[PDB]
Design a protein around this motif. Structure first.
Motif, mmCIF file in Angstrom:
data_model
loop_
_atom_site.group_PDB
_atom_site.id
_atom_site.type_symbol
_atom_site.label_atom_id
_atom_site.label_comp_id
_atom_site.label_asym_id
_atom_site.label_seq_id
_atom_site.Cartn_x
_atom_site.Cartn_y
_atom_site.Cartn_z
ATOM 1 N N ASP A 79 0.813 -1.211 0.000
ATOM 2 C CA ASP A 79 0.000 0.000 0.000
ATOM 3 C C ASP A 79 0.849 1.265 0.000
ATOM 4 O O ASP A 79 0.468 2.259 -0.628
ATOM 5 N N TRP A 80 1.995 1.257 0.681
ATOM 6 C CA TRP A 80 2.795 2.470 0.782
ATOM 7 C C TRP A 80 3.677 2.701 -0.439
ATOM 8 O O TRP A 80 4.641 3.468 -0.353
ATOM 9 N N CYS A 81 3.385 2.048 -1.562
ATOM 10 C CA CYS A 81 4.057 2.311 -2.833
ATOM 11 C C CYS A 81 3.008 2.500 -3.921
ATOM 12 O O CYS A 81 2.843 1.646 -4.802
ATOM 13 N N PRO A 82 2.275 3.616 -3.889
ATOM 14 C CA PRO A 82 1.266 3.834 -4.936
ATOM 15 C C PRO A 82 1.872 4.148 -6.289
ATOM 16 O O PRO A 82 1.333 3.714 -7.314
ATOM 17 N N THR A 83 2.971 4.902 -6.328
ATOM 18 C CA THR A 83 3.651 5.184 -7.586
ATOM 19 C C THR A 83 4.184 3.894 -8.196
ATOM 20 O O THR A 83 3.727 3.461 -9.257
ATOM 21 N N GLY A 84 5.155 3.280 -7.526
ATOM 22 C CA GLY A 84 5.532 1.908 -7.782
ATOM 23 C C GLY A 84 6.380 1.646 -9.007
ATOM 24 O O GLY A 84 6.793 0.498 -9.207
ATOM 25 N N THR B 54 8.858 8.135 -11.282
ATOM 26 C CA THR B 54 9.782 8.040 -10.161
ATOM 27 C C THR B 54 9.028 7.589 -8.919
ATOM 28 O O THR B 54 7.917 8.054 -8.655
ATOM 29 N N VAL B 55 9.643 6.676 -8.167
ATOM 30 C CA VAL B 55 9.023 6.153 -6.955
ATOM 31 C C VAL B 55 8.985 7.212 -5.857
ATOM 32 O O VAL B 55 7.998 7.323 -5.122
ATOM 33 N N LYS C 221 1.511 8.135 3.358
ATOM 34 C CA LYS C 221 1.610 6.681 3.389
ATOM 35 C C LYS C 221 3.067 6.235 3.384
ATOM 36 O O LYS C 221 3.463 5.350 4.152
ATOM 37 N N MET C 222 3.885 6.842 2.522
ATOM 38 C CA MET C 222 5.315 6.563 2.550
ATOM 39 C C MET C 222 5.966 7.105 3.814
ATOM 40 O O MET C 222 7.064 6.672 4.176
ATOM 41 N N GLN D 132 -0.193 10.464 -0.962
ATOM 42 C CA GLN D 132 0.897 9.538 -1.247
ATOM 43 C C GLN D 132 2.060 9.740 -0.285
ATOM 44 O O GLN D 132 2.707 8.770 0.126
#
Ligand SMILES: Nc1nc2c(ncn2[C@@H]2O[C@H](COP(=O)(O)OP(=O)(O)OP(=O)(O)O)[C@@H](O)[C@H]2O)c(=O)[nH]1
Ligand SMILES: Nc1nc2c(ncn2[C@@H]2O[C@H](COP(=O)(O)OP(=O)(O)OP(=O)(O)O)[C@@H](O)[C@H]2O)c(=O)[nH]1
Ligand SMILES: Nc1nc2c(ncn2[C@@H]2O[C@H](COP(=O)(O)OP(=O)(O)O)[C@@H](O)[C@H]2O)c(=O)[nH]1
Ligand SMILES: Nc1nc2c(ncn2[C@@H]2O[C@H](COP(=O)(O)OP(=O)(O)O)[C@@H](O)[C@H]2O)c(=O)[nH]1
Ligand SMILES: [Mg+2]
Ligand SMILES: [Mg+2]
Lengths: 55, 430, 99, 427, 427, 430
Positions: free
Chosen positions: B336-341, D178-179, D387-388, D384
């Motif tokens: 979940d904590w990697c939406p970009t990914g 980009t991550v 969450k990270m 975003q």
């Protein structure tokens, strides 16, 4: 005055349609080019990368 | 310009290496003698006006593998100093390759790699290859990185190693070497890529149409990935990726670094004639479990950030539509904590075909590096195999006699155990 | 030609009429075209050769001219009916001949 | 004599910048060797806005290119118009970018910050007057986002009066390159809010949507996408370079559009973009441009204006045209759709007219608007980021460089307050 | 300048529309590619009602074609007339029609609805004035019955004043093309009663009967059957497009023939119709036209007026003719058959005359009437609906889409009260 | 544009595949190699150059039938991965082909159908062919439809199966597999067609003039019916019929979907010159019991819905007259709760002839698909035959040993009884 401006507007439009038609011609040319490159690749696979030629 | 140094250890590393440099000289246009019948500076040096030399060092503790290169056609390309051979190999014994025999050759090699780093004005990292089961691959590989860590420090040291297979095995002491080298690997390496022979055997028989392969074909497939990985530094592209970008983008934590590999399309010559192989097709083929170069199913675990590298005719519009579609696929999970990914790169120069190679020539191809919790499946199997032998202590006497203290066996065993729950904690979500 | 109401239909097939007249009419105009579903782009302005296959389309109705295999006793003999309709097979292709 | 200094940072900046000078040089009539071969006197009137003249009839742009690795710089010079730039304005490092904001700001930025400012100094103090600077950078990266903002602080301290107009590319919502963008963009906004005067937000997906919807490009490449952005940068400064019936330069734009110091993020769009086949159906009228600019699909940023309310709007028109016709369209478009405009500001649409159009087109227009819909794009990156942040994600890479954990908390708090600030003024 | 926008829905609408655009294009003398190859200046006086002009001498219809599956649309493209229409006005889905009213209304209709409405916004707000819209659809199908009614509600919400004229085809009583028709016809009529100002009902059986009786066609295809429908659609709007002695457009027609808002279902009939061989011998005059119009056999809808009574009737005449001769017939036909008109409304026959006839005909007349004979049409479908609804299993196709059985009860009750209302004004 | 995917199971399915795809290729005009000497994209994909590939998958659990295609003339047209063959056949055992061997290969096929679905922008349904009596056709076909039900959901899964003949039988275990397969079909199949071999033999000898047929001649009769069924999707017509229109109009209830098929005119190439064959004549021929492809007499029951498809110079006016007349007769009974009962589809492309064929060059033809209560006659025969064999437990040992629990035998028997109740409840009148 009205005669002069109207003719200038008409001339501009015909130029623009002529340029549009030119781009359409080249666009058709591009897809013809892509098909030929694809046939070149099939030639390379069919005649030069053959299972009787693997190291 | 910008420079990369390659270091090769053991039989696996060396005979992978000459396969890779066979590709690279062919790609740039350099004859085996080093002359010509650009991006050379990233990998080669010019002596005077005519001759090139690889930035590579070949190391093994026994001369059979190295001397094959010395008598070969490519012998004139390499500098005689780059080919370093020991007297007697480590006999697949980590202690012998680390303490007794490894220290007999460590300082000779460290001068030679350092001397090559002087010629690299804009050096940005190293590539190092291992075989985990080998004594020199694991034993001397640990000693090389421990010294290299303090020598250079803030430089990106990437590794490309062969994980022992789930069932295919050629060494009985294989679990012992892997765990001991893992503890040294984890603190010092910036990032190391996992591959195994068993998955490469199945892929190169199923996708590539070969009944009876050898190590030679597998070494080619490894070269394709490394060539595409370095393609951003050498040739033009609409989205460039430097070495330092892989380090930050892929690894969420310090110890979770280990990614896995994938590549598509892998297809026979007379089947690529039959199939379209567009941008969306090759992207879909990457995510199937069959194309994974490590025989672990990602469906058992979850995906963190993934990196994609495209080569050839790919256009940025089609890329975004393809990866957006793969997000709609509900057979693929993401934490979940990697939406970009994702991290994408597009390069123009197509893959380089080989005289008498089996891979077909697609004008567009894609390479993938993905970090997943499915690798914890492989750690459990390696741990179970080690646990059975160590309970009755079936091979301790060989290691202790060659300079190793036993207390290192449980400590490295605990460090792996910590990593096992390192992956389980990351797999959870809130 | 004309556009097939109940007062303008061919006298055998009852398809679109083709007729002869002395009157200056917009329907009298005929435009020529090359065979094929996309060929017009390549050769829009090339000169037509004798015996070359072409299509004859009526400007106001943009449809080709077709002979239909049906006869009536025109007291000159027995002459095939002509219609202007949807292109099919190759009965609608015409070739000019100078002799 | 209102000179502007141009600064490009990173992979995104150099490639957008390289295409940018192809547009201007053809507009003014400069051969890629740098010499004048034009057709009209009006082109040589005010070329001093962007160019310097080396003795001999050779014109040099006021361009400074910034990067941490010289990889993209060398790709530019091999291009057609690479020879134009002064060789000593190429400032680059010898270390990797790292795609890391803290690495760009602290480790490599400080080393380059010493030299880059003096290159800015030569170009900033070689002219009779200076209106402002011009920055091109992306926010998702580590070089454009990190080193671009550091130079922004130095420029503000040294030259406070001047207008620091910046053009930015915002990370995309669906697929993004980009991550670690949520860390990079969140920190970058902290510097952009307090230092910059004008900021324009461009989203790559909207560029793709326009190309596939309108221009019907079967395979749009980054040359075409960067072509669209160049027109907007060309359009805004056209009031400086050419005469007009109603002039409106940069400083007029900021005063009218910006009601409060922190609300200055803008969306843009360009008309007419004509489909390669639809032209023969489209008659160019002054109303025809107006429909395209305010159309939501034409907006270059993927935040829907309909979901918010407008605060100010501006339309720029180019060519010889009736002044009545332009003024009428502003009144009609405002009165027809009153639901998307704020009551306590009447006459929300600003207008201007410039005489010389882009080549090939007898009329063209440019739009700049400010709306509460930007609350959409900040909430995305805030969601975003948290969450990270909740678990310690990639953070350890930024902390090792030397960045304190308290910098993120200041960054998120300031970013959060700008979300509330848009909400408050909606009422 | 009373522009009319045209919308075609479904398989039935497109084939009717495709034939319809041939008829007017001939009337105005317009080439299929869009160029005027005409014969008189009077055709250009008020061509703006139906065609837009693209610079280049090309005329584009104000048409939007709507479908759920692309099969019907490609028939239009590949057809002779495939270039005339604007490409953006083709909006189609990628799902089956389903031949289902509920699925089209709720499942697929919602997605296409917003896409459709913006295309209308382009056409509706492109003209100086707008009298009304025009929709053609069938009630037995799934797309035209389901999506057609959904669009009709939205158009009422946005443009309440404008005249929403619709031409509808009602399922045939003896042999019909679809099994689920009683469910599709019942639910559609509920929507049509409260939404559209005017509804014209056409039955396929009368067209087979009319062609086989009068025109003496042995094998009538849909090409000639639609030709009769297109004559009625052109005849109604003939007053807008051409001058005349006494004008009467749509809103005059709605005011006069509709005594109460709910009783507005109309039947149509056209004269002269004469055999293709018998036309030479016929002395076609004004008295001759009236004999054909009011004759029960020329009614395009299978509802024999003799079983009911007329409430209002309207007649349109086209061509150079005597006003005295027209007025006398309206007296005589109203006086000779006094058993067929309501006593509490004197002068039940409206009249109008237009100058310019359609091609080939020196004079023609059109009839529009409203009568209580419509009770016949709705009695048949309600009985068949009741017969099927007694076994709720077919409803399962409609329940799986979300429609509740109460909506069947609501639709049938509203239709039933309409029938009773017609009965009680008969006295 | 609009597309269907064909799935073939078993010996009957593959042999039908050659019969149908020979017609599709010939009618569209594509050579067996994939070149040309339009609707093409509904059935075939283009790969560039000029090469086309069918959108179909052939499945069987024994290699003999598939390898005839792989070695046959048409071998180049089909793509190798589509042709899937197992190791050992199901031996006319439902449990074997459903649990043991079926599950050995089920997941491999599901990738190829889904991968074939990626090239589908406008997919609107599937077509699946069975033979009820066979092992794989029932066992694996049931397992395939159950998975495709959840993989894709609300997509039309049409079937075209061979119901067991009323007396003619080739396997003794035929009643066991037919009943067990029926339970899997009913809940998951959108609509399933039945034809039977015994009726085709009588039709292929009486109407078409052949003393002795083979399975090849029967397959061509089915090929014509399928071609007419899909002609509306491919070619212009006054009244098209999409798949979705077919589904709603025919089935009155969830479980009553089972139609029957008929085709007219079927007449020898010699006698076909002798009749004008008007629309009225050919329409009357369909309704006779002799022309029915299922050997159940419609007069014993009633008609529930009907659909007619016309392929030729057929005008809408004369269709209505013929359908009106057949309504006036009182030998075609209809349930009075279905007053309308018809959907008519019209297409312009005439039927296509085949070299070495058995039919003529007919200028107009009609295809008929109607649901009848007379099919309850067929279910009664199968139910009684299964009862005799199961009463003495004649073959239970084979099926139970191959993974099937005995409780399925009464469950399948009970479920068929409910279906028989449904058909009798539908036949009731109010
Ligand atoms: N992919 C690949 N793997 C190889 C190859 N050669 C050896 N390996 C792997 O290497 C492992 C054996 O160890 P070595 O290659 O001898 O490594 P080493 O460090 O030289 O071992 P020492 O003899 O102690 O020096 C086995 O697990 C093999 O699978 C190769 O050519 N290709
Ligand atoms: N009409 C027709 N029926 C066929 C044909 N081929 C086989 N059948 C039927 O198929 C039945 C036997 O089953 P199989 O042909 O073996 O089908 P299957 O599902 O593959 O069964 P297994 O081979 O055991 O796996 C026979 O009773 C035939 O009725 C054919 O070409 N045409
Ligand atoms: N419009 C446009 N965007 C680009 C181009 N090249 C890169 N980008 C975008 O810029 C973003 C960040 O680029 P990056 O490589 O990090 O630039 P950096 O600042 O030098 O590190 C990515 O999300 C890309 O999608 C280009 O040529 N045109
Ligand atoms: N008069 C006439 N009726 C038509 C035509 N095309 C279709 N129909 C009728 O339309 C009815 C059903 O149309 P359908 O295919 O369901 O269209 P849909 O509304 O899009 O689903 C049938 O009863 C046809 O008789 C035509 O060209 N003319
Ligand atoms: Mg070794
Ligand atoms: Mg089988």
């Amino acid at each position: 005055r009205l005669q002069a401006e109207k003719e200038e507007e008409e001339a501009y439009n015909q130029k623009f349609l002529a340029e549009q038609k030119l781009l359409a011609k080249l666009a058709a040319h591009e897809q013809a080019e892509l098909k030929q490159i694809q046939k070149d690749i099939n030639e390379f696979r069919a005649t030069r990368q053959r299972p009787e030629m693997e190291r | 310009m910008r420079e990369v140094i390659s270091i090769h250890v053991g039989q696996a590393g060396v005979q992978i290496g000459n396969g890779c440099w066979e590709l690279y000289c062919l790609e740039h246009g350099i004859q085996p003698d080093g002359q010509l019948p650009d991006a050379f500076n990233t990998f080669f040096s010019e002596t005077g006006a005519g001759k090139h030399v690889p930035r590579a060092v070949f190391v093994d503790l026994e001369p059979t593998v190295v001397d094959e290169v010395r008598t070969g056609t490519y012998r004139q390309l390499f500098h005689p100093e780059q080919l370093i051979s020991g007297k007697e190999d480590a006999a697949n014994n980590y202690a012998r390759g680390h303490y007794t025999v490894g220290k007999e050759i460590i300082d000779l090699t460290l001068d030679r790699i350092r001397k090559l780093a002087d010629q690299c004005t804009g050096l940005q990292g190293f590539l190092i290859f291992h075989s985990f089961g080998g004594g020199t691959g694991a034993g001397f590989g640990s000693l090389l990185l421990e010294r290299l860590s303090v020598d250079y420090g803030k430089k990106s040291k990437l590794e490309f190693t062969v994980y022992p297979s789930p069932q295919v095995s050629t060494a009985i002491v294989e679990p012992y070497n892997s765990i001991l080298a893992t503890h040294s690997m984890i603190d010092h390496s910036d990032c190391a890529f996992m591959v195994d022979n068993e998955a490469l055997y199945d892929l190169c028989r199923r996708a590539l149409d070969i009944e009876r392969p050898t190590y030679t074909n597998l070494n080619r497939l490894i070269g394709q990935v490394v060539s595409s990985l370095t393609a951003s530094l050498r040739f033009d592209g609409a989205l460039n990726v430097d070495f330092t970008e892989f380090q930050t983008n892929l690894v969420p934590y310090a110890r979770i670094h280990f990614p896995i590999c994938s590549y598509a399309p892998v297809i026979s010559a007379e089947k690529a004639y039959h199939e379209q192989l567009s941008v969306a097709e090759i992207t879909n083929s990457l995510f199937e479990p069959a194309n994974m170069m490590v025989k672990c199913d990602p469906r058992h675990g979850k995906y963190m950030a993934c990196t994609l590298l495209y080569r050839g005719d790919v256009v940025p519009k089609d890329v975004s539509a393809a990866v957006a579609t793969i997000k709609t696929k509900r057979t693929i999970q993401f934490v979940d904590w990697c939406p970009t990914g994702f991290k994408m790169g597009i390069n123009y120069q197509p893959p380089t075909v080989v005289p008498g190679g089996d891979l077909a020539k697609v004008q567009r191809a894609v390479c993938m590096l993905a970090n997943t919790t499915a690798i914890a499946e492989a750690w459990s199997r390696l741990d179970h195999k080690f646990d059975l032998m160590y309970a009755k202590r079936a091979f301790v006497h060989w290691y202790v006699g060659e300079g190793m203290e036993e207390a290192e066996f449980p400590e490295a065993r605990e460090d792996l155990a910590l990593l096992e729950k390192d992956y389980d904690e990351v797999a959870a979500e809130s | 030609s004309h556009h097939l109401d109940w007062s303008h239909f061919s006298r055998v097939s009852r398809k679109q009429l083709v007729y002869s007249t002395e009157k200056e009419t917009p329907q009298a105009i005929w435009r020529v075209e090359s065979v094929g579903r996309d060929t017009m782009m390549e050769m829009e302005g090339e000169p037509v050769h004798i015996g070359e296959p072409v299509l004859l389309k009526n400007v106001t109705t943009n449809l080709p001219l077709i002979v239909q295999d049906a006869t009536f006793l025109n007291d000159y003999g027995s002459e095939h009916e002509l219609i202007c309709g949807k292109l099919a097979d190759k009965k609608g292709v015409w070739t000019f001949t100078d002799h | 004599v209102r000179e502007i200094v141009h600064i490009q940072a990173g992979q995104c900046g150099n490639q957008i910048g390289a295409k940018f000078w192809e547009v201007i040089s053809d507009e003014h009539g400069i051969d890629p060797t740098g010499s004048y071969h034009g057709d009209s006197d009006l082109q040589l009137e005010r070329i001093n806005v962007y160019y310097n003249e080396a003795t001999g009839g050779k014109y040099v742009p006021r361009a400074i290119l910034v990067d941490l690795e010289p990889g993209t710089m060398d790709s530019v010079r091999a291009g057609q118009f690479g020879q134009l730039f002064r060789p000593d304005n190429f400032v680059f490092g010898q270390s990797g970018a790292g795609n890391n904001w803290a690495k760009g700001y602290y480790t490599e930025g400080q080393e380059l910050c010493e030299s880059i400012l003096d290159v800015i100094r030569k170009e900033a103090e070689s002219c009779d007057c200076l209106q402002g600077f011009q920055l091109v950078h992306s926010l998702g990266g580590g070089t454009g986002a990190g080193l671009g903002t550091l130079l922004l602080n130095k420029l503000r301290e040294e030259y406070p009066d001047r207008i620091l107009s910046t053009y930015s590319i915002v990370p995309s919502p669906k697929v993004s390159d980009t991550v670690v963008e949520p860390y990079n963009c969140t920190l970058s906004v902290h510097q952009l809010v307090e230092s910059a005067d004008e900021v324009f937000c461009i989203d790559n997906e909207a560029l793709y949507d326009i190309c596939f919807r309108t221009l019907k490009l079967t395979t749009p490449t980054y040359g075409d996408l960067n072509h669209l952005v160049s027109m907007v940068m060309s359009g805004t400064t056209c009031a400086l370079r050419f005469p007009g019936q109603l002039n409106s330069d940069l400083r007029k734009l900021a005063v009218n559009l910006v009601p409060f110091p922190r609300l200055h993020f803008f969306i843009v769009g360009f008309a007419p973009l004509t489909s390669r086949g639809s032209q023969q159906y489209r008659a160019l009228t002054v109303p025809e441009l107006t429909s395209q600019l305010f159309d939501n699909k034409n907006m270059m940023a993927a935040c829907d204006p309909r979901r918010g309310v407008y605060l100010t709007a501006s339309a720029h028109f180019r060519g010889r045209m009736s002044s009545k016709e332009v003024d009428e369209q502003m009144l009609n478009i405002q009165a027809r759709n009153t639901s998307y405009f704020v009551e306590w500001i009447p006459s929300n649409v600003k207008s201007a007219i410039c005489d010389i159009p882009p080549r090939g087109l007898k009329m063209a227009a440019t739009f700049i608007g400010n709306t509460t819909a930007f609350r959409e794009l900040f909430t995305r990156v805030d969601s975003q980021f948290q969450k990270m942040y909740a678990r310690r994600a990639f953070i350890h890479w930024y902390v090792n460089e030397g960045l304190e954990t308290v910098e993120f908390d200041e960054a998120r708090s300031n970013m959060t307050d700008l979300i509330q600030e848009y909400e408050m003024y909606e009422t």
